[PDB]
Amino acid sequence: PRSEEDNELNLPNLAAAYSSILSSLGENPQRQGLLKTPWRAASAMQFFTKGYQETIHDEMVIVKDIDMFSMCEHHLVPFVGKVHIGYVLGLSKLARIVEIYSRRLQVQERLTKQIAVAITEALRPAGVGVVVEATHMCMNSKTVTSTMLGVFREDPKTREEFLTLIR
Template sequence: MTLTTTDDLRLDAPPGADLDAAESAARAFLAALGVRCDSPGTERSPRRMAEAYAAMLAPRPFAMTTFPNDEGYDELVVVRSIPVQSLCEHHLLPFVGVAHVGYLPDGRILGLSKLARVVEMFARRPQVQERLTRQVADWLDAELAPRGVGVVVEAEHLCMALRGVRAVGAVTTTSALSGLVRDSPATRAEFLAAVHP
């Protein structure tokens, strides 16, 4: 869904988003925390906050593009360092990092940009990293029917860096493997070596 902001800028937002209601709620939330929004620098902060969260929760739509595997390509396809930005569902603070996604083709191959789109599709919602990793792998398994899938996500969680333990720079790594990428020791090692050369 695309909404028009008060500045006539286009803004992507999740379906059903009401930016005016979100702005009012943000203003009340900030006031409840003792944050004043009456200076030139902060008077639009509730609107900006609403727009920022709307953008973080809105994946871009895409159509899955696959092609016949006419050449019979049967080696790993790996895309490394796909940017990941999501919101921790427990604190609604961002976690950011990279995803490494690979698959062993069977009858079809995938347009490479679609691997990044799938990551974004599952990341742009309140999420936990473990589920995100599994969702990307399961979606590729279901939609592409490859001989195997591997997904590794590495991310820093601001809920851990900015509050609680305040472990700035700590990186969480999760993985989801299926098919031959999970069951064949050689293929698994090849995927992990491609992810971290």
């Protein structure tokens, strides 16, 4: 994991790289609006990737419309959307699981699988289903991905009920 001291050590290094980008784009890094941009861009990129340092009944429970912000690892442009989860844990820590994996350089299919595997390893339930619907700024087209584990993968009725209960 990347500790807090790693973040403080790499912050001036990230700012130096963003200063370089401002010059390479044709901008004047000395103009008032850009003066603090190398540090602000560095802090933003550290915040969007803070998940690297992080670590942790007879009814279907679903938490839908959870807002999600991730970064596309191919172009370093954000992708934003919603996560729908099905499977006992509450909204808190479920949100924490989403934020640990979404706050990284990702691909939507990987992010989807990591969320379902994290819920499975935390709760050890009969099954888990995760659907992510997001808009990629690296391309208004929506990308929908899904990962089913346990009874959500094996039982078609369970799988079908979860997919209908999102609307």
